[PDB]
Amino acid sequence: QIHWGNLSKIGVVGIGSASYKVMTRSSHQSLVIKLMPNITLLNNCTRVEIAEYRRLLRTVLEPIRDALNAMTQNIRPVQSV
Amino acid sequence: QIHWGNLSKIGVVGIGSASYKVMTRSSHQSLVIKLMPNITLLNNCTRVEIAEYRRLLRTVLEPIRDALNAMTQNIRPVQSV
Amino acid sequence: QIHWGNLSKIGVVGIGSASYKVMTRSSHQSLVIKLMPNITLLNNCTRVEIAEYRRLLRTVLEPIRDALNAMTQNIRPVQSV
Amino acid sequence: GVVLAGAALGVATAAQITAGIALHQSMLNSQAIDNLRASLETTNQAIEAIRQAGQEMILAVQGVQDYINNELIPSMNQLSCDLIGQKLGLKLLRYYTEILSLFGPSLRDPISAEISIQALSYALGGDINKVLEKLGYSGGDLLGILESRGIKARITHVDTESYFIVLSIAYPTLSEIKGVIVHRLEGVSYNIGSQEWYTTVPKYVATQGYLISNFDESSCTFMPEGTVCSQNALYPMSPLLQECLRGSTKSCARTLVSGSFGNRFILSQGNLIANCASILCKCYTTGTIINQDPDKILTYIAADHCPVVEVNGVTIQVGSRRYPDAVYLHRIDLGPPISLERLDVGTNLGNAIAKLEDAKELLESSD
Amino acid sequence: GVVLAGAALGVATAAQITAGIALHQSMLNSQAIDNLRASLETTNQAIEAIRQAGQEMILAVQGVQDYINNELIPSMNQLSCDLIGQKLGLKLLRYYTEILSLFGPSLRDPISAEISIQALSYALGGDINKVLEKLGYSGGDLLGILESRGIKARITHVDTESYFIVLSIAYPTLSEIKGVIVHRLEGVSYNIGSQEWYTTVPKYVATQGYLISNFDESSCTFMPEGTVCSQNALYPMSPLLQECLRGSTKSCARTLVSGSFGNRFILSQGNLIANCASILCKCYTTGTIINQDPDKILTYIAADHCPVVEVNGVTIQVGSRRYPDAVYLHRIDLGPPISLERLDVGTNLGNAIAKLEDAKELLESSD
Amino acid sequence: GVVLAGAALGVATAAQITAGIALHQSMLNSQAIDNLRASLETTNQAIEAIRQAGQEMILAVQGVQDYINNELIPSMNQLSCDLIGQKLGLKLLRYYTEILSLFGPSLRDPISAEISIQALSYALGGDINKVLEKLGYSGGDLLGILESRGIKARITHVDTESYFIVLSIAYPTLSEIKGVIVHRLEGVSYNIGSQEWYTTVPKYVATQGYLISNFDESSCTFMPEGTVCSQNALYPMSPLLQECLRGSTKSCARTLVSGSFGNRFILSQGNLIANCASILCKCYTTGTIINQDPDKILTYIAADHCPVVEVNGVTIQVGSRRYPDAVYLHRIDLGPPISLERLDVGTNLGNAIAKLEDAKELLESSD
Ligand SMILES: *[C@@H]1O[C@H](CO)[C@@H](O[C@@H]2O[C@H](CO)[C@@H](O)[C@H](O)[C@H]2NC(C)=O)[C@H](O)[C@H]1NC(C)=O
Ligand SMILES: *[C@@H]1O[C@H](CO)[C@@H](O[C@@H]2O[C@H](CO)[C@@H](O)[C@H](O)[C@H]2NC(C)=O)[C@H](O)[C@H]1NC(C)=O
Ligand SMILES: *[C@@H]1O[C@H](CO)[C@@H](O[C@@H]2O[C@H](CO)[C@@H](O)[C@H](O)[C@H]2NC(C)=O)[C@H](O)[C@H]1NC(C)=O
Ligand SMILES: *[C@@H]1O[C@H](CO)[C@@H](O)[C@H](O)[C@H]1NC(C)=O
Ligand SMILES: *[C@@H]1O[C@H](CO)[C@@H](O)[C@H](O)[C@H]1NC(C)=O
Ligand SMILES: *[C@@H]1O[C@H](CO)[C@@H](O)[C@H](O)[C@H]1NC(C)=O
């Protein structure tokens, strides 16, 4: 299909061929990011910092939760029609 | 202005519009990077490292100071003309 | 060669020229990445972690060693012809 | 009022001139420096608002002080003096590497450079959240977050006697340009023969009165109530591509789908626009396949003919018709096929120029 | 079976529709959340497989727990309570910055986003190797490494009551497309006069039955037994560049070498193809220089004429001839000269369009 | 003298051949490896010059030794044995991730790869300053800094018995090419009607005897006494854009300003070149506005007519005239309007090719 002879007359050569494999994704596995650490062995020494951390997180987490709910609330079982 | 009907005949649709807001910068606030740390509670234990740090910094800081002076020395109050 | 007058009639000016210096590499110096740390003052406390580290490294190092051997085994002194 | 010595300076861009004057208006006076120098000497925190009544607050940041205070000082009578010095030396070399990276020779024009607050992150101790709280940003809503991250700094003073850098920042606020509408465009593939095509248009365009413009979404965040951009996003669009978006289908280019698929369908205005030659379309309500007329290129599915449609295995209820029934391909002027890979562009342009130089000799001989 | 409320939703890309249904099929049921919430509360490790018999294993990761467990807890009765809090606060702000960076407003469409496992690295504690071992990846061969790094995650649940994010991943495996061959192309310069040229072709192309295609090597690893790509790599090639690769030398474009050299020679099929006008070529066997015929542009060196050749100071033994003796330049149709810099492309296209608009007025007047 | 087995090897680029021979010339002899292996075993520092009299110095670096020596060993009798192992394990996994990232499958050709010293930073313990000091670089002037950061390494040996990698570096020094002058170009907008244009030229060009060339400033630092580039920066420029820079104004393309402004003025040779149709220009000396003749496109402001000019609110003193008084637009041949967005380029090229294929049928019928 590729004409190596005519290409070689203008300085182009093939220096390797290979088969082509693509990654396809299958099966599933749930991964959970636990954002709140276990601090019990710190005896209330991080209470202010943890509360502030939690407050910063809410600004980030609420829009994502809302975006996910906006989609799944439009997904009903078939017989609702 | 955009003709959605004719575009839809060749598979192009609009899937959202929004207003356009750009950030403009106003007011001012000074921020200072203090390059030299307070080491007094280390009792001369970092004297060699601090002196070497200072020497490395000079190579970087002097050209910038010089570039800033090269400009402001050409900026005089109006009556110098 | 560049015609500053005609360019200025369409708003283009030169705002600086400089000589051109390129870096050329010369001489040589050997640098060795020692991947295995000295752990003797840790009294066998990292034996499991070190062994696992070594196992992960082998997957990476063997193909490179093989690629280097594939080339140098084709490089002989001149008189082999 | 100040004047620039233009004959002395000789050459400068508008950007350098305005930043140079700005440098004069915003740099601290000569003895505020001596005051600042003395305040810095007597402090020992990582971040500190330096307030001298009369003068404005100056935010001072020390990039390795938290490490000294939290890690080295509490070890002061448990580790050797050599070890303490070795520990701090490693931090100082890593910090110097960042100062060098940001303020070294890779900084082309220190007078007009604007450094983003995030690029200053390491110079400020590896995190900028406490700086932003001291300046009044709470982190409580996403817009304040975007604005806080749009802060840019200019260098106004470099002290080689006491080793500090004074920067001036400005606060971003939102400027709504009510006449500009940003539009997100999205395409579906269609079939001509055995070739699968789609129309090449930008992902985002802007309308602005008479104009259709390009839109750079790089610096933008698509908030629910508006597009927030930290920089100008509008850029010119060629008249031909504007004509394409104005309804001239022959002006729109097209290309073949990559890989083996496009987006073969899309939900828009409660209807399904689908390439039903390329995927299985089926009316769920009646159980009957939906065939695409072979001299049509797309199917526009609405509830007047199929209330619940299945499309590539997904079941979608649709609303009333908002898109006309497909017309025959012969009633659509399709535009030119193109490739967007740069080498394909160059090879085809070289050929076109060569064909044009041939044509340049023939039309004088006959005429 | 589920149905999407398309009239209610109004607008959605195919990607958003399929990810939305996938979100329904893969999200945890409402009380598995209450169970998961309780399991998370009672654990204290950095990474932990949460097994509740009946339900599938859920891998829980806590991004600052190793720091708390290894650095803060052992200091609990040697540092002050304030200092302990200050130490953890710095980690939490740095961790929040990463959560914000990944899950904040820069994430355009959380429903259809696919986050690479490496982009999750900081959210998972700064390293992903232990996660991959718990999922069964050993790190023992390079292919498993590539597959493990091809994992992408989707968000399936965000808990604002207990602050956790549930993601679903899928395992990559290799799908061989036996009809596609990937080819690496490599060129040598040749001289026309005092100009040094080379032919402009892509570094990688693919053949696929009748088709020659472009190939994006960005996502590929060239393993010894095949090209492994984590994404589709095939993309269309214009017919003209395909014709070039099919032997039409006049369709191939060319450009001048950058700097002052090309690749003036190459070993291919045991022969040396060399621009011997531009470098010294010499037969080592006989000691005689190898001159390039001046109406030829390249020299094809094989053992029939020179068993051991010296080329730019390097001595190479060659095999029997696999490339014909060079033909005269006059027997080669060379293609158009081009530039690939984008401004050069734009300037030459603007000129060509202008020349074409002139030509648009002349050929009706004479005809 | 060595010879390459080209028939055995079959295929290789010039880059691979020269690096392969270089590999033979620079790799350590077989028993220097056994010596090096024994020296490495008995050392315990993060960085160490290994001197064996007779042989050259070899710089040995251990990427986690400072952490072991500074953090783990001093804790040896205060933390449990398990905890010590857990602490080091985290460092080893993070270090392995970097080794994998740099030396794993993403490294296409280990024989001819050149790894920048900065890319080795993490493999060398997270910072390169101490390595550079041991090699003789002081950090005392910016040029030595640039040269030190231009070091590239080649792999010469990988030891799978004792797990170490030998690299060979070379020292960069500056090679001045006295015939090449680098020029920075800078434009101001001008008005044609209600359209605001500027001429499209590159930011940097190079003159080289007869030639004007493109210039890639990516790898360059603009030092006060010369442009220092760590790589070749020169690249071809199309003849048409060269003609533009040689004074053919009709060869220069132009485009519309982005957003709503250009650079409406610039200081050059002590004069102000200004689009005074687009901004307020005013003579400060006399207090009188400076109007732009409407059949002129720019104003060239010098001290013969206005010693101190105000331009967009900035006051600039100017020198004697170095640019002629503006000529009428009708005495300037303007070049073609263009767009640089790639989709606009593709759409206009597709149209031009289509118009050219029409034209390909008409000029034989009449002729
Ligand atoms: C919508 O598209 C069609 C083409 O697909 C336009 O119709 C063409 O218009 C040109 C010039 O206006 C005529 O010369 C052609 O004969 C028409 N072609 C066909 C197939 O009808 C129509 O004008 C477009 N509408 C808009 C607003 O642009
Ligand atoms: C190999 O290349 C040559 C051109 O370099 C091709 O020969 C030309 O073919 C065209 C049309 O086929 C003729 O009109 C020309 O007269 C030929 N030119 C010369 C110099 O011979 C040849 O066909 C090519 N082979 C292949 C398979 O494409
Ligand atoms: C400077 O620019 C002008 C055009 O802006 C050049 O003058 C043109 O030259 C061409 C061919 O040389 C003539 O056919 C035109 O009639 C001229 N046009 C005008 C408006 O005068 C002039 O030659 C340029 N100078 C240089 C060195 O290129
Ligand atoms: C450093 O810190 C001490 C305690 O905060 C402070 O009082 C002093 O002024 C600073 N010391 C020096 C030498 O700068
Ligand atoms: C945290 O850790 C302790 C010990 O692992 C565990 O028993 C407890 O359930 C967790 N504590 C809290 C308050 O979540
Ligand atoms: C490690 O360090 C000790 C002390 O530096 C040194 O004497 C020894 O040779 C090294 N030990 C091992 C087991 O490699």
| Ligand 5 contact, E31 CB (< 6 A) | no
Q: Ligand 1, atom 13: nearest CA belongs to which residue? A: D333
| Ligand 5 contact, A17 CB (< 6 A) | no
* Substitution target from B3, B27, B29 for chain D, most D beta carbons within 10 A: B29
E–F CB contacts, 8 A cutoff, strictly below: 167
Q: Ligand 1, atom 19: nearest CA belongs to which residue? A: D331
Q: Is residue E100 part of a domain?
A: yes
* E44 and E134 both lie in a single domain: yes
Q: Is C18 helix (H, G, I), strand (E, B) or coil?
A: strand
Burial grade of C57 (CB within 10 A; 0-12, 13-18, 19 or more): buried
- Resolution limit, Å: 2.6
Cα(E72)–Cα(E85) distance, integer angstroms: 9
Ligand 4 atom nearest D42 alpha carbon = 9
Tokens of E361: 């007025």
What are residue E125's phi and psi, to 5 degrees? 105, 10
Q: How many angstroms separate the CA of residue F31 from the nearest CA in chain C? A: 15
Tokens of D212: 């259709």
Q: Is D160 helix (H, G, I), strand (E, B) or coil?
A: coil
**Cα D346 to averaged position of ligand 3 atoms, centre (Å):** 29
Buried b (16+ CB within 10 A) or exposed e, D61-90: bbbbbbbbbbbbbeeeeebeeebbbbbbbb
Tokens of F262: 């250009």
E strands along E200-289, which residues? 204-208, 211-215, 220-223, 226-229, 234-235, 254-256, 265-268, 271-274, 281-283
Burial grade of D201 (CB within 10 A; 0-12, 13-18, 19 or more): buried
Q: Is residue F30 part of a domain?
A: yes
What element of type H or E holds F24? Answer: helix F14-26
* E165 and E32 both lie in a single domain: yes
Q: What is the DSSP string of F43-56?
A: --SSEEEE--TTSP
Q: Is D339 helix (H, G, I), strand (E, B) or coil?
A: coil
Tokens of E95: 């961790």
Rg (CA), chain D: 31
Cα(A52)–Cα(E179) distance, integer angstroms: 57
* F145 and F41 both lie in a single domain: yes
Q: How many angstroms separate the CA of residue A44 from the nearest CA in chain E? A: 8
Ligand 2 site, CB within 6 A: A 3, 6; E 247-249, 331-333
D–E CB contacts, 8 A cutoff, strictly below: 167
Handedness of CA F230, F232, F238, F244 (dihedral sign): positive
* F136 and F232 both lie in a single domain: no
Cα(A80)–Cα(F101) distance, integer angstroms: 51
Angle at E7 between CA E2 and CA E8, to 5 degrees: 80
Contact residues, chain A, for E124 at CB < 8 Å: 33
- D335: Cβ contacts below 8 Å, ≥ 6 apart: D199, D244, D249, D250, D251, D252, D253, D254, F347, F350, F351
What element of type H or E holds F191? Answer: strand F190-192
* E37 and E114 both lie in a single domain: yes
- Domain end point (choices E120, E145, E169): E169
Query: What secondary structure letter does DSSP report for C35?
Result: -
Cα(F168)–Cα(F145) distance, integer angstroms: 20
**Cα B45 to averaged position of ligand 1 atoms, centre (Å):** 83
Domain ranges of chain C: 45-75
Q: Is E43 helix (H, G, I), strand (E, B) or coil?
A: coil
Other CB atoms closer than 10 Å to residue C66's CB: what's the count?
Answer: 13
β partners of residue F234:
F215
Percent composition of chain B: helix, strand, coil (DSSP 3-state, to 5): 45, 30, 20
- Contact between E47 and E63 under an 8 Å Cβ cutoff? The reply is no
- The CATH number of residue F215's host domain is 2.40.490.10
| Cβ-nearest to C59 among E139, E285, E308 | E139
- C28: Cβ contacts below 8 Å, ≥ 6 apart: F26, F168, F169, F170
E strands along F16-133, which residues? 47-50, 58-62, 115-116
* E19 and E109 both lie in a single domain: yes
- Contact between C37 and F67 under an 8 Å Cβ cutoff? The reply is no
- Domain end point (choices F221, F245, F261): F261
Structure-determination technique: X-ray
Q: Is residue D140 part of a domain?
A: yes
- D349: Cβ contacts below 8 Å, ≥ 6 apart: E338, E345, E348, E349, E352, F349
- Exposure on the CB side of residue F315, measured as CA atoms within 13 A: 15
What is each CA distance from E343 to C64, E167, F199, F275, F334, in whole angstroms?
41, 45, 11, 24, 17
- Decide the pairing of beta strands F254-256 and F271-274: unpaired
* E143 and E191 both lie in a single domain: no
Contact residues, chain C, for D13 at CB < 8 Å: 15
Q: Which residues form the domain of F207?
A: 177-261
* E140 and E183 both lie in a single domain: no
* E101 and E156 both lie in a single domain: yes
Cα(D72)–Cα(D79) distance, integer angstroms: 9
Of E255, E288, E293, nearest to E277 by C-alpha is: E293
| Cβ-nearest to C59 among E141, E307, E308 | E141
Q: Is D264 helix (H, G, I), strand (E, B) or coil?
A: coil
Q: Is residue E134 part of a domain?
A: yes
Q: Is C10 helix (H, G, I), strand (E, B) or coil?
A: coil
* F64 and F111 both lie in a single domain: yes
Ligand 4 site, CB within 6 A: B 38, 40; D 41-42, 44
**Cα A17 to averaged position of ligand 2 atoms, centre (Å):** 26
Count of domains observed in chain F: 2
Contact residues, chain E, for C59 at CB < 8 Å: 139-142, 145
Q: Report the neighbours of A using a cutoff of 3 or more CB pairs below 8 angstroms.
A: D, E, F
Best residue among F190, F242, F249 to mutate for probing ligand 3's pocket (most ligand atoms within 8 Å of CB) is: F249
- C2: Cβ contacts below 8 Å, ≥ 6 apart: C14, F183, F205, F207, F212, F245, F246
* E161 and E179 both lie in a single domain: no
Q: Which amino acid is at E141?
A: D
E abuts F (3+ Cβ pairs < 8 Å)? yes
Q: Which amino acid is at E215?
A: F
β partners of residue B20:
D227
Q: Is F199 helix (H, G, I), strand (E, B) or coil?
A: strand
- Domain end point (choices E115, E146, E169): E169
Cα(F299)–Cα(F309) distance, integer angstroms: 12
* E75 and E152 both lie in a single domain: yes
| Cβ-nearest to E258 among F11, F83, F232 | F232
Burial grade of D184 (CB within 10 A; 0-12, 13-18, 19 or more): buried
Nearest chain C residue to D16 by CA distance is C15
Cα(D268)–Cα(E37) distance, integer angstroms: 38
Cα(E13)–Cα(E366) distance, integer angstroms: 53
β partners of residue B22:
D175, D229
Contact residues, chain A, for E172 at CB < 8 Å: 23-25
| Residue recorded with tokens 């493990």 | E148
What are residue F115's phi and psi, to 5 degrees? -100, 125
